Amino acid sequence: MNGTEGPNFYVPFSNKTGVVRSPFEAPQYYLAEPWQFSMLAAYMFLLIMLGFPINFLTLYVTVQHKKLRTPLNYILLNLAVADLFMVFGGFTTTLYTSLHGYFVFGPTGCNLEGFFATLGGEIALWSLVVLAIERYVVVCKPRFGENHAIMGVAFTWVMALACAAPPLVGWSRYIPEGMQCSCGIDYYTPHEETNNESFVIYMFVVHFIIPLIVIFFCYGQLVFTQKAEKEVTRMVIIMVIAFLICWLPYAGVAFYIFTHQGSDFGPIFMTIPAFFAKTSAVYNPVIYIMMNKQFRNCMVTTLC
């Protein structure tokens, strides 16, 4: 093995020189310089200070304006609420961890950082499944109304909790990654007590591949088969593209590690894809403002 396994961690750094220390006990300065950690903390402080206002505003405008009750309006409001849980439930721990260079709050802090990012990411993925079905029904007419949109909202939380929750209670586990200042699913160790292998297969099949198959089925039916409907279909296309840009690098590296456990990689290998993925809390309302005229006008009316 080229890294160091402990009871509840896997450090991507060899202990042949004796310097490896648990990421729950001491700063991780042996594997990176302090200025590198301070870049993580500065990046996290930015996302917190932008994420809270742009998601609170999206929530506030939606509730204030009763005209915003299309399926798109409901899903975007749901994403704003899940984004706020990521910022305050999860990102507050990332920032504190990045300031000191390790999980000062220990395994509990790791569980908070990982759970809310896994929860929020899967709400976004299953929301895109809901919108793809809605677009397919609306455009191909093979009616999707208010009830179906709200039923879809509750559906996203059920599926996302079915992915984020078991690692809290004994199926897989959340474990620090990269420079050890963020947490994710354990792709690194067998750890039979938690049946790690079955959960990763379950996560990738049910909560990655099956949703993508549904989205591209509905899209395929769209392509091989009015102005207000076109504006919504155009935004959903960009929402899916943005999701792929955000999460595919992380998905590929995680799957590579899972199929190459113990291989020679360093802390930076997962650090960059992990922290790039955390932009997921911010970008959806930015698309919303740029690609939905009615909502953008409501925000200007509310703001001014």
Ligand X SMILES: CCCCCCCC/C=C/CCCCCCCC(=O)OC[C@H](O)CO
Ligand Y SMILES: *[C@@H]1O[C@H](CO)[C@@H](O[C@@H]2O[C@H](CO)[C@@H](O)[C@H](O)[C@H]2NC(C)=O)[C@H](O)[C@H]1NC(C)=O
* Binding positions for its own copies, rule: CB under 8 A: 27, 34-35, 37-39, 41-46, 49, 95, 98-101, 296, 300, 304
Q: Which partner, ligand DAO, ligand NAG, its own copies, none, binds residue 269 by CB below 5 to 8 Å per kind?
A: ligand DAO
Residue 221 assigned to a binding site = no
Nearer to ligand X, 225 or 264 (CB): 264
User: Quick check: 276 binds ligand DAO (CB under 6 A)?
Assistant: yes
Tokens standing for residue 82: 């899940």
Report whether 218 contacts 132 (CB < 8 A). Answer: yes
Residue selected from 249, 255, 261, 279 as contacting ligand DAO according to rule CB under 6 A: 249
C-alpha 208/C-alpha 210 separation (Å) is 6
**Residue 44 class from Cβ within 10 Å (0-12 exposed, 13-18 middle, 19+ buried)?**
buried
**Stretch of 12-20, 132-140, 172-180, 234-242 contacting ligand Y, by CB under 6 A:** 12-20
Residue selected from 104, 150, 212, 272 as contacting ligand DAO according to rule CB under 6 A: 272
Q: Which partner, ligand RET, its own copies, ligand Y, none, binds residue 6 by CB below 5 to 8 Å per kind?
A: ligand Y
Residues 59-98 vs ligand RET: string with x where CB under 6 A? ----------------------------------------
Q: How far is CA 6 from CA 10, 201, 205, in A?
A: 6, 23, 28
Q: Which partner, its own copies, ligand RET, ligand DAO, none, binds residue 70 by CB below 5 to 8 Å per kind?
A: none
Nearer to ligand X, 169 or 303 (CB): 169
Handedness of CA 219, 221, 224, 229 (dihedral sign): negative
Number of residues that bind ligand Y (CB under 6 A): 6
| Rounded least distance, CB 48 to ligand X, Å | 14
User: Quick check: 7 binds ligand Y (CB under 6 A)?
Assistant: no
Number of residues that bind ligand DAO (CB under 6 A): 6
Residues 246-285 vs ligand NAG: string with x where CB under 6 A? ----------------xxx---------------------
Q: Which partner, ligand NAG, its own copies, ligand DAO, none, binds residue 37 by CB below 5 to 8 Å per kind?
A: its own copies
Q: Which partner, ligand X, ligand Y, ligand NAG, none, binds residue 170 by CB below 5 to 8 Å per kind?
A: ligand X
Integer-rounded Cα radius of gyration of the chain: 20
User: Quick check: 190 binds ligand NAG (CB under 6 A)?
Assistant: no
C-alpha 246/C-alpha 241 separation (Å) is 9
Angle, CA 253 vertex, CA 273 and CA 106 arms, to 5°: 65
- Residues 19 to 58: which contact ligand Y by CB under 6 A? 20, 22
Residues that bind ligand DAO (CB under 6 A): 249, 253, 269, 272-273, 276
